[PDB]
């Protein structure tokens, strides 16, 4: 017996103990969504015996203000406002115990301009909750008022095309191969041959940073020599993605500043550096007139399986906000996962000023991009010029088509490989622009161009029947 016992809360909601999250304010099917709210769509798979609304309310609670037992300290805050609300819970089509949960979060929950803070709430703890055996974040509605606190792309595709003086076609690129083992001088050789032969860009591989077989400075030095040789040889602006990925921010800055000092138009970074280093680089790139390419290293660890993780379209949104200028977004027909309708959703999320709901493409929220600049999608991995009609159709005009093996694997050399890709691209673009059914006629369009291009003839002969036909793991829940 004491003053503590005497002043205990008798109110049923705020007396001590455990009560369901759906009775704590985190379930409200009548909640009126505000235009400033952050919305999230989760695919929720409850454990046996767990109610779908309760699972959804738990996700809402533990990603906003709740814990597992009632706390009086709620009453020191405007708690009715700060609690997130699951406001719609629906069955996912063609599943037994899987649900779409729409959750609203007030704009005041979040730190302005911080991907780390947004993700700390939305994905921090809720994916490990015992009560849901699986959870996937499918989409988010980032309101205009929160988007305005972010830079968006440092450069964006419009300014990128202006810097490169290249309009009305995809960009071309290539990853240098083998992935690891080349010296700085050999790296420069490959870059020179690829650019001089017709490619707009080449790139360091994601895992090429600084290593015993090649330290970073010589690579950057030889690479800019190769670039400038190729510019003088062709009269085109050219670039090589110098990879500044490193262990610490100080090392990344040292590498980015050196690349800047050499006059590169472009650098790259890997997703594995993480969100805070990426945002830091996005700001640096805006300040230093640099195209910032993001390789999505590690993304498929959480993005591959339909029942659990984070769909890549959400990552597209966060990285566009963070300030990258390119991101890898799929090929459909190459060696990596890529359902065509999912990919269409990714490319639209990166490039459009505004998205309408489009359930077949996995676009669950209307998304105003608040005039943030546009991210150039990058199609890379296991593609070849025999697919050029398919690439132009699935992926469109605003993309970098990267052919690593598809350039350097050419039997007549790296220049020949580059020339094949460049001729194939222009042949397909001109046919599309003339109104031709270039998808139906594509193989013949490529054969016709090959009649006056030995390198293309050889590339078609070598690779034309190479396909990567496998069932997709990441697929839509609705069809047109």
């Amino acid at each position: 017996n004491s003053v503590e016992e005497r002043t205990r809360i008798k109110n049923e909601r705020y007396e001590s103990g455990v009560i369901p999250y759906a009775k704590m304010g985190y379930w409200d099917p009548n909640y009126a969504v505000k235009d400033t709210d952050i919305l999230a769509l989760f695919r929720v798979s409850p454990q046996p015996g767990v109610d779908p609304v309760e699972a959804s309310a738990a996700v809402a609670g533990e990603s906003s203000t709740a814990t597992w037992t009632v706390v009086w300290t709620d009453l020191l805050t405007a708690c009715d406002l700060y609690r997130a609300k699951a406001y719609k819970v629906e069955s996912v089509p063609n599943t037994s115990d899987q649900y779409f949960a729409y959750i609203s979060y007030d704009i005041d929950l979040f730190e302005e301009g911080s991907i780390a803070n947004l993700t700390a709430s939305i994905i921090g703890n809720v994916f490990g909750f015992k009560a849901v055996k699986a959870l996937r974040l499918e989409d988010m509605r980032i309101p205009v008022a929160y988007l305005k606190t972010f830079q968006g792309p440092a450069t964006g595709i419009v300014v990128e095309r202006e810097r490169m003086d290249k309009f009305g076609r995809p960009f071309l690129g290539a990853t240098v191969k083998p992935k690891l083992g080349l010296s700085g001088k050999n790296y420069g050789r490959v870059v020179y041959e690829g650019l001089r032969g017709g490619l707009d860009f080449l790139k360091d591989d994601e895992n090429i940073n600084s290593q015993p077989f090649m330290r970073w400075k010589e690579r950057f030095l030889y690479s800019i020599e190769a670039v400038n040789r190729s510019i003088a040889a062709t009269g085109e602006v050219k670039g090589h993605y110098m990879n500044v990925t490193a262990a610490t921010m100080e090392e990344m800055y040292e590498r980015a500043e050196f690349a800047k000092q050499l006059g590169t138009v472009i650098i790259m970074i890997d997703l594995v550096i993480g969100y805070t280093a990426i945002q830091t680089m996005g700001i640096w790139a805006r300040k230093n007139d640099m195209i910032l390419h993001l390789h999505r290293a590690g993304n498929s660890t959480y993005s591959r399986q339909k029942i659990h993780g984070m769909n890549f379209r959400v990552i597209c949104k966060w990285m566009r906000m963070a300030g990258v200028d390119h991101i890898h977004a799929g090929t459909v027909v190459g060696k990596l996962e890529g359902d065509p309708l999912m990919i269409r959703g990714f490319y639209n999320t990166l490039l459009l000023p505004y998205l309408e709901v489009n359930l077949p493409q996995g676009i669950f929220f209307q998304q105003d991009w608040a005039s943030l600049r546009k991210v150039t999608p990058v199609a890379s991995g296991g593609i070849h010029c025999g697919q050029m009609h398919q690439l132009l159709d699935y992926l469109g005009n605003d993309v970098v088509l990267q052919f690593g093996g598809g350039t350097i694997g050419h039997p007549d050399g790296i220049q020949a490989g580059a020339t094949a890709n460049r001729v194939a691209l222009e042949s397909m673009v001109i046919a599309r622009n003339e109104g031709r059914d270039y998808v139906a006629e594509g193989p013949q369009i490529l054969r016709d161009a090959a009649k006056t291009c030995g390198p293309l003839q050889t590339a078609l002969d070598l690779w034309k029947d190479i396909t990567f036909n496998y069932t997709s793991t990441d697929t839509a829940d609705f069809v047109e």
């Binding site: 003088a232 673009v429 622009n433």
Partner: protein
């Protein structure tokens, strides 16, 4: 050497019929079209000379083809390109640019190098054509 600026410069020089089809494409997208020319082939020569004003709200490809011919009478010895512009918000930029005339001989560029700090060098692209004054280059 062949200057490979422009969307179609790895393909042979475009015929008037090919050019008209690209103009038709631009018109079908409601893009503004203009014609520019230069005798400085530098990759960062951003401002080629204007041949009149851009043509906005174009119904007829023949109007563009007429001006192409008229520009060629004065400047077919040098570079001429056709650009298309889209003023839709979020684009507000060129969306197509291709070469329609080239000089008979393009000598290309000397890569100039200067020694700088440690192993760093400074680079410059020197156009051989620009060894002579405007009017005497090609």
């Amino acid at each position: 050497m062949r200057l490979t600026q422009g969307t179609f410069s790895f393909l042979p020089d475009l015929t008037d019929e090919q050019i008209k089809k690209q103009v038709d494409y631009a018109i079908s997208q409601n893009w503004a079209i203009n014609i520019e020319y230069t005798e400085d082939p530098h990759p960062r020569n951003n401002f080629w000379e204007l041949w009149g004003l851009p043509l906005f709200d174009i119904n007829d490809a023949a109007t563009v083809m007429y001006e192409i011919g008229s520009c060629r009478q004065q400047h077919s010895n040098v570079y001429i390109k056709v650009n298309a512009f889209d003023n839709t918000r979020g684009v507000e930029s060129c969306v197509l640019s291709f070469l329609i005339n080239r000089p008979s001989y393009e000598p290309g560029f000397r890569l100039v190098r200067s020694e700088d700090i440690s192993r760093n060098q400074k680079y410059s692209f020197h156009s051989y054509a620009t060894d002579k004054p405007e009017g005497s280059r090609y």
